[PDB]
From a paper:
We characterize the binding of IAA to MarR-family regulators from both iac and iad loci. Most characterized MarR-family regulators function as repressors by binding to an operator sequence upstream of the genes they control. When a relevant ligand binds the MarR repressor, it releases from DNA, allowing gene expression. The structures of MarRs from representatives of each auxin degradation operon type establish that each has distinct IAA-binding pockets.
The strongest binding to IAA was observed for the IadR MarRs from iad loci, with MarR_3CDH from Ruegeria pomeroyi having the highest affinity (KD of 0.237 ± 0.099 µM). As with the V. paradoxus MarR_50, the secondary IadR2 MarR from B. japonicum (MarR_Bj2) did not bind to IAA. We also provide crystal structures of MarR regulators from P. putida, E. soli, Bradyrhizobium japonicum and A. baumannii.
Author numbering:
A (entry chain A): 9 to 97, 106 to 160
B (entry chain B): 12 to 98, 104 to 160
């Protein structure tokens, strides 16, 4: 888009920053609504998810991988320790209750993901993910 | 079951579009701050550059902000000379000065976009955008 901003609706439909912003907003709103039933929010869920994958992380790494501000991540990790989902091993990990909670919330999350990908070929999903992953490599400030 | 491994997380589109949107928006706000602009004003200019007129609530959808934030920023943009109120409700239109400002500051965002798409082929950009646009159609609550 060297010569100028996207100018028509058809051009906007090809402008990836608009698309990932509109998507992230609606996905996160819907997810936060569903998570409210469990008394947690997106940041807590994303923290459970990345601790499930990595087992232990520092609070700084949680902030990066769960995509939240460092100050918000430290306060939320303390909240999650108080509520028995995370333990302090500055590295933290899941408690059994934290893993159980992730497991119990995943059916609804999987249903939301199924709706997200309706009408999209698996090969196109793979190309889209490869593109977005390289974009993350291009602009991330933290190399994790 | 949730993404369980690092490789799975690296291919998980909701993680990717959240991490991307966060860093892109933070960078954009930082780079625009020197020009007295924020994310919402810039994205409002950007979508009125396409549509010319929109209601405030439509601006909130397409510029991806809260309705209340959009209303306050639109009023600021009236004082900035960048939009004008029109006569169904809360209609605003881009002024020639608003168009000129967007064209003037665009090279900053074009630079950021060039960084974003480094190492990504045009055909893969096209596939990525088509996937994300269908995802928007699948989950959007507003039919704009």
């Amino acid at each position: 888009w060297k010569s100028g901003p996207p100018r028509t609706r058809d051009q906007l439909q090809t402008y990836i920053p608009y698309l990932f912003n509109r998507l992230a907003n609606r996905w996160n709103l819907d997810q936060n609504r569903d998570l409210s039933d469990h008394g947690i929010n997106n940041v807590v869920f994303r923290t459970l998810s990345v601790l499930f994958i990595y087992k232990t992380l520092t609070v700084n790494e949680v902030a990066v991988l769960a995509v939240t501000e460092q100050s918000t991540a430290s306060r939320m990790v303390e909240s999650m320790v108080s509520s028995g989902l995370v333990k302090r091993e500055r590295v933290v990990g899941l408690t059994p209750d934290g893993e159980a909670l992730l497991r119990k919330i995943w059916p609804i999350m999987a249903s939301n993901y199924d709706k997200l990908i309706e009408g999209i070929e698996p090969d196109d999903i793979e190309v889209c993910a490869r593109v977005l992953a390289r974009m993350v490599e291009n602009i991330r400030q933290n190399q994790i």
